[PDB]
Amino acid sequence: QLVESGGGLVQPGGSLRLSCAASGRTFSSYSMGWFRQAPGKAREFVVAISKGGYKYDAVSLEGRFTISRDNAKNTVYLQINSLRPEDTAVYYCASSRAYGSSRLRLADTYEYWGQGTLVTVSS
């Protein structure tokens, strides 16, 4: 149902956008989250956008990610300005029933998961 795209090898300091398309019926009533697994780490919450369109930042990612959705294309986007080597990870998209709250920061709030897409930041 969810298929991410946009991954690849990108330069530090530049910006990059990833997409997540959801298959079948409209996803406008899902909250959508982005999660990542860096090499060697446990999964980390990045940012979420509620059904309402409100942004939920992580507690420790320091306001560096910007999320938007396109209910007119099945698509939520993740934006990373000024990519740093620490951004390297498999990025997963996920969809939740839940409403905007501090629960959208939790991986267990999400029912549907993408297939993943690799972002590699390197000079």
Tell me, what CATH number does 61's domain have?
2.60.40.10
Tally of structural domains, the chain: 1
Residue-number span of the structural domain to which 53 is assigned: 2-100+111-121
Asked whether residue 24 is domain-assigned, the answer is: yes
Asked whether residue 106 is domain-assigned, the answer is: no
117, 85 contact by CB (below 8 A): no
Name the method of structure determination. Answer: electron diffraction
Structure tokens at 92: 């997963």
Q: Are strands 16-22 and 75-80 parallel, antiparallel or unpaired?
A: antiparallel
Task: Tokens 């509620």: give the residue.
Answer: 50
Burial (Cβ within 10 Å: 0-12, 13-18, ≥19) of residue 73: exposed
38, 86 contact by CB (below 8 A): yes
22, 74 contact by CB (below 8 A): yes
Asked whether residue 35 is domain-assigned, the answer is: yes
Euclidean distance between CA atoms 28 and 73, whole angstroms: 10
Angstrom CA distances, 26 to 30, 47, 54, 68, 74, stand at 9, 21, 19, 16, 6
Asked whether residue 105 is domain-assigned, the answer is: no
Q: Is 102 helix (H, G, I), strand (E, B) or coil?
A: helix
- DSSP codes of every residue in 21-35: EE-SS--TTSEEEEE
Task: Write the CB contacts of 28 (distance below 8 Å, at least 6 apart in sequence).
Answer: 51, 71
Angle 19-86-120 from CA coordinates, rounded to 5°: 50
Euclidean distance between CA atoms 82 and 62, whole angstroms: 13
The DSSP H or E segment spanning 10 is strand 8-10
